[PDB]
Amino acid sequence: TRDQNGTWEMESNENFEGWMKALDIDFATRKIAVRLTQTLVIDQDGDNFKVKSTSTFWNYDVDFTVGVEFDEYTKSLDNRHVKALVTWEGDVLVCVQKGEKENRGWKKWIEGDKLYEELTCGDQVCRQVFKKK
Numbered sequence: 001t002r003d004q005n006g007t008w009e010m011e012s013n014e015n016f017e018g019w020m021k022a023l024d025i026d027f028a029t030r031k032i033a034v035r036l037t038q039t040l041v042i043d044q045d046g047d048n049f050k051v052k053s054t055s056t057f058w059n060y061d062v063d064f065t066v067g068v069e070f071d072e073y074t075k076s077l078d079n080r081h082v083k084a085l086v087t088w089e090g091d092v093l094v095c096v097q098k099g100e101k102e103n104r105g106w107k108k109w110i111e112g113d114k115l116y117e118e119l120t121c122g123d124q125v126c127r128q129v130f131k132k133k
């Protein structure tokens, strides 16, 4: 299934600190951020997505259309300019962000009642699991 709609509460977070290090996030931010539980809110209608990632420490929102490239500034995360593109590989939603960092982007897919996420940058992969609230 491609239905990623919902409010998703984190269950598991693996190697988030490694992914942040690959993005060059400063020590202070990483040490706080790695402690925190995350929430993902996805609104999905056809190709049109609104995605919000939140903790007590950050709020990161992005809107996009599947299949349409968009220039984006990564704002409070690492303040970099990338060219982003989100597409379907089967029922895996795949984002590639072209720019200074290699292998940058993410993957999201559904397994039963849970949403699985990969965050990639450089040679780092962060693996996450969320349950549907």
Ligand SMILES: *C/C=C(\C)c1ccc(-c2ccccc2)s1
Residues within 6 Å of the ligand: 051, 053, 058, 059, 060, 062, 076, 077, 106, 108, 119
């Ligand atoms: C689909 C998942 C996305 C877009 C994100 C998951 C964590 C993100 C993030 C942004 C800023 C600061 C920390 C984490 S975005």
